[PDB]
Amino acid sequence: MLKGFTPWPDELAETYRKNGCWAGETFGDLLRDRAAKYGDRIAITCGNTHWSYRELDTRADRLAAGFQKLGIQQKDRVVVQLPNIKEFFEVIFALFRLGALPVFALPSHRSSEITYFCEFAEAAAYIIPDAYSGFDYRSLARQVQSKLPTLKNIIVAGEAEEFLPLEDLHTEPVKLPEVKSSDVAFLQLSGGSTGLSKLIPRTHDDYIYSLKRSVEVCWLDHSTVYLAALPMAHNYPLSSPGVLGVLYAGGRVVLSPSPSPDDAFPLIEREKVTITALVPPLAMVWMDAASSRRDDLSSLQVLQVGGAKFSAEAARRVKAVFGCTLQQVFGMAEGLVNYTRLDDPEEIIVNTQGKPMSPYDESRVWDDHDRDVKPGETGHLLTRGPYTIRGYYKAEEHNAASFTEDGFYRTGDIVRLTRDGYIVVEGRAKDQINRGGEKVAAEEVENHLLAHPAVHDAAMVSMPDQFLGERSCVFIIPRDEAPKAAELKAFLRERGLAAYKIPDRVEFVESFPQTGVGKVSKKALREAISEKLLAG
């Protein structure tokens, strides 16, 4: 077993195989089978270019031969930081057949974050593009080497310059070592705050299972045309059901150069995408655009919004604005993924974050002392299942703090189970606002503010206060001409918003700092108000 990997228990694992959750097939097996089954069907679409499943299968084998020849071995970690391009697919599946382990970095990561990844994972290779969205990644690669000379295999999809051109790593296919579905297939990146970023070992079995249950819940099939709008390396646009869930269902993937409507809308009309995924901030952007920018988006059947809670005040609009069904997705790269069903009532789709996609997903809402909080009550979320990890990669410390003795992962979210099984997210524990004895949920205030005519978006965060411990500062994005702070505080007051919840402070900005996948980084906003405060 990979060093640093925590196995599932013998009983559970055995039960996961008996109940057919772990199908004993690898990603290499998946692509082989799909290529043999689907042959010339278009698997990936990027611009004016296309790649049939059979073509992917082949390019993957050739790329594997080249990698092996270059020196990459089974169990070797490779840092993969590519944009939404075709190469990404052939690269990971090639690594999959070599038993080599990818480390899914995002195109928004820089020297500090990549160096950590390569160091920590002891990467034997670094795969990047020559340039994307105006950023030169080879220059970033040089910065990495100076700070990490040991790193000797920088592969580049594009103009390699002094590096190793990924395109010449394609050669005559060879026999590769055995790859067990029980082996760790790759390392993901957690999505909390702070930055460190823990790595997440995911096996062929548990991840392929997540894909399967995702396809069934999101109704993917050969007719599915999924638009990859979010950086597809993130767990969400990658498997919930993501680009891979689409491969699994034999559907068709459309690669968008950017999450922007400017790039997405034309592609939705042209390639007739039936589904795509967004995060809250981006959904707002799209909803505005869907109004003052008329183009055919009618083929759209399912719009997914997740990564962070999509406040009901905005969620309610999706149906009217887009003419399709909204689907909230509340998943995590550590495992558990909740979806609103495409079936259930609008009320549910608009007011909940869904329920576990697997009958074998478990949940324990607890209080500050680890007591099964009273049904319906709010509390800390813990989950356990067929595709939720038992330990982060090489991290004894954080693992004690993150997993209970019974194997329950501490998601770090604060939620309340609906008396059926659905979850209604309140917000991350870290984003809770401890204001003078009170526990303030930011999203509640934000959802209210989203109902104001002059508000495009709103993100409330905490600021230090020697008296109350913490205070609240809400960052607002104007729908044009910034309203007066007092005007918003009045708005909330008239809505019946509890006094202690009203934002102590208000800040206007043209946008919010973001995480790699594109959600709002409340750790940055906190740092913003913090810094700004000590200015006086």
Side-chain angles (χ1 to χ4, degrees):
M1 303 183 291
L2 178 73
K3 180 54 192 164
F5 165 74
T6 295
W8 266 264
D10 302 302
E11 290 190 57
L12 274 288
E14 208 304 303
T15 301
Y16 289 167
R17 305 208 179 81
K18 261 274 287 186
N19 287 176
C21 295
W22 292 358
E25 88 209 289
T26 65
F27 280 99
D29 301 323
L30 207 175
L31 180 46
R32 194 74 75 193
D33 170 85
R34 299 304 185 291
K37 271 197 55 179
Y38 311 140
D40 204 24
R41 186 190 306 183
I42 293 305
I44 303 164
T45 291
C46 182
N48 241 182
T49 54
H50 315 285
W51 279 8
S52 69
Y53 282 82
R54 182 91 63 188
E55 167 164 11
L56 173 57
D57 190 23
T58 304
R59 297 176 65 99
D61 286 316
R62 293 176 70 70
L63 196 49
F67 281 169
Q68 185 174 68
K69 193 165 174 181
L70 189 65
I72 297 182
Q73 305 186 310
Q74 184 170 51
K75 283 214 296 180
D76 285 348
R77 282 70 69 184
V78 177
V79 169
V80 188
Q81 174 169 32
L82 300 151
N84 289 7
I85 54 179
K86 299 187 300 292
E87 289 64 40
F88 172 87
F89 299 85
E90 81 180 319
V91 171
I92 68 186
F93 277 95
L95 288 170
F96 282 152
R97 311 234 239 230
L98 244 90
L101 277 46
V103 187
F104 295 115
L106 272 52
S108 44
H109 287 141
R110 294 302 180 260
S111 63
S112 177
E113 294 147 299
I114 291 305
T115 313
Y116 169 68
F117 292 171
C118 296
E119 197 152 1
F120 186 51
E122 290 168 44
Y126 182 21
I127 298 166
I128 60 176
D130 38 38
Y132 169 64
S133 191
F135 182 69
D136 198 327
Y137 292 83
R138 310 105 105 199
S139 73
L140 159 56
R142 293 190 193 69
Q143 308 185 76
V144 169
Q145 295 201 301
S146 56
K147 299 201 298 181
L148 199 67
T150 44
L151 173 57
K152 281 209 170 300
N153 298 312
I154 301 297
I155 296 171
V156 177
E159 236 49 73
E161 287 188 313
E162 72 240 53
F163 298 114
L164 297 171
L166 175 67
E167 66 173 349
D168 302 311
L169 288 175
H170 292 76
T171 190
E172 212 49 52
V174 309
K175 264 72 84 70
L176 300 323
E178 175 173 49
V179 169
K180 296 168 173 187
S181 64
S182 66
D183 296 327
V184 171
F186 64 71
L187 300 178
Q188 256 294 169
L189 322 189
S190 50
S193 53
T194 289
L196 173 68
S197 193
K198 321 284 178 167
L199 267 46
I200 305 177
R202 295 302 290 277
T203 64
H204 290 269
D205 265 307
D206 79 277
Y207 211 63
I208 287 184
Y209 172 76
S210 70
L211 295 182
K212 174 167 174 170
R213 269 269 72 194
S214 285
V215 176
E216 308 177 313
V217 181
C218 304
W219 308 345
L220 304 194
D221 59 55
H222 73 289
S223 285
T224 299
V225 183
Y226 181 93
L227 175 75
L230 296 158
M232 40 176 225
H234 186 82
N235 198 59
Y236 176 21
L238 176 69
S239 63
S240 299
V243 303
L244 295 176
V246 181
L247 291 185
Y248 189 103
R252 184 180 152 231
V253 181
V254 179
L255 297 176
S256 177
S258 76
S260 169
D262 283 310
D263 285 311
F265 282 29
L267 254 20
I268 285 189
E269 166 164 47
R270 188 178 212 182
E271 301 309 329
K272 264 126 185 56
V273 320
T274 60
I275 179 164
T276 190
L278 322 172
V279 299
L282 183 57
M284 310 309 286
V285 175
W286 279 40
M287 289 191 278
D288 290 352
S291 313
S292 288
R293 191 177 191 301
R294 300 181 182 180
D295 44 278
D296 210 355
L297 303 188
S298 56
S299 66
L300 218 51
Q301 283 160 49
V302 175
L303 190 70
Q304 295 183 309
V305 182
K309 184 178 184 184
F310 191 42
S311 309
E313 175 50 46
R316 63 176 194 171
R317 298 173 48 197
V318 169
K319 185 172 169 188
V321 177
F322 299 107
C324 61
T325 289
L326 159 59
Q327 174 179 57
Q328 308 212 192
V329 187
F330 166 43
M332 47 204 80
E334 282 84 4
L336 173 62
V337 178
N338 304 285
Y339 302 95
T340 43
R341 299 301 182 284
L342 308 182
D343 279 67
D344 54 30
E346 182 63 329
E347 180 197 9
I348 284 188
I349 294 179
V350 163
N351 298 293
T352 74
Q353 327 307 318
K355 62 172 173 187
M357 70 172 154
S358 178
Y360 300 120
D361 271 306
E362 287 178 274
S363 304
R364 299 298 173 66
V365 191
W366 293 355
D367 47 49
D368 307 296
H369 289 299
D370 292 56
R371 309 170 186 181
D372 316 63
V373 71
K374 298 194 176 186
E377 288 293 283
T378 279
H380 304 287
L381 180 68
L382 295 77
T383 184
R384 195 174 64 184
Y387 60 89
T388 291
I389 69 175
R390 291 298 183 115
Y392 284 102
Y393 182 63
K394 301 193 177 184
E396 282 198 1
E397 279 196 294
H398 208 59
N399 282 36
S402 297
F403 301 88
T404 72
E405 300 296 343
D406 27 291
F408 270 91
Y409 167 59
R410 290 193 151 96
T411 91
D413 305 281
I414 281 168
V415 317
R416 77 160 199 278
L417 293 177
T418 198
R419 310 198 183 76
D420 357 352
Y422 284 51
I423 300 178
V424 185
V425 166
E426 186 177 89
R428 295 207 68 64
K430 255 62 63 53
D431 297 350
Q432 187 183 293
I433 296 172
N434 145 46
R435 190 184 180 288
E438 295 293 1
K439 175 209 77 168
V440 175
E443 181 276 315
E444 169 178 350
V445 186
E446 290 159 355
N447 184 52
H448 270 303
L449 286 171
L450 284 180
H452 191 290
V455 177
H456 165 278
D457 210 336
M460 185 170 68
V461 105
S462 74
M463 43 176 211
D465 199 291
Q466 53 177 173
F467 305 98
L468 311 179
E470 246 160 54
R471 208 83 167 188
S472 66
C473 173
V474 59
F475 288 75
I476 301 289
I477 291 177
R479 174 153 296 302
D480 199 314
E481 220 159 0
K484 298 295 184 177
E487 197 186 331
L488 298 184
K489 288 183 175 182
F491 182 77
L492 301 175
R493 196 183 301 124
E494 192 289 324
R495 284 195 149 223
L497 189 290
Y500 71 96
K501 290 167 182 172
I502 290 175
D504 290 298
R505 180 156 178 163
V506 176
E507 288 303 333
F508 291 101
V509 290
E510 184 172 354
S511 70
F512 304 146
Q514 310 190 315
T515 57
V517 65
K519 38 182 173 174
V520 167
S521 179
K522 291 189 178 181
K523 177 195 172 176
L525 290 172
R526 284 196 290 288
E527 289 189 48
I529 181 61
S530 181
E531 273 186 58
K532 202 156 193 169
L533 278 177
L534 314 180

